[PDB]
């Protein structure tokens, strides 16, 4: 039965969950017109992008 090593599995899982959340957080707009930085920097003027 493989369930014996619960702790060693859960210490990996708890880290993997946060490491995935930190990268998935990148999608959000935070109120900007568009999430992609190169998109904003292309369709817009340097005085606006800031």
């Amino acid at each position: 039965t493989a369930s014996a090593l619960g702790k060693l599995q859960d210490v990996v899982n708890q880290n993997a969950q946060a490491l995935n959340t930190l990268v998935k957080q990148l999608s959000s707009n935070f109120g900007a017109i568009s999430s992609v930085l190169n998109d904003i920097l292309s369709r817009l003027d340097p005085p606006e992008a800031e």
């Binding site: 292309s42 369709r43 817009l44 003027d45 606006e48």
Partner: protein, 49 residues
């Protein structure tokens, strides 16, 4: 056209330089939204209406 029956045209399969619109001074008003008017020469679109 008259505002009750406004007129529409659909443009595709085109190659156009907008720079002349900024050399011209015949427009009482010229305002664009959502795109920087100077960079229009570097872009592409699926249709223009």
């Amino acid at each position: 056209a008259s505002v009750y029956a406004w007129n529409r045209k659909r443009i595709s399969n085109c190659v156009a330089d907008y720079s002349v619109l900024y050399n011209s001074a015949s427009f009482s008003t010229f305002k664009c939204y959502g795109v920087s008017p100077t960079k229009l020469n570097d872009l592409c679109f699926t249709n223009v209406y």
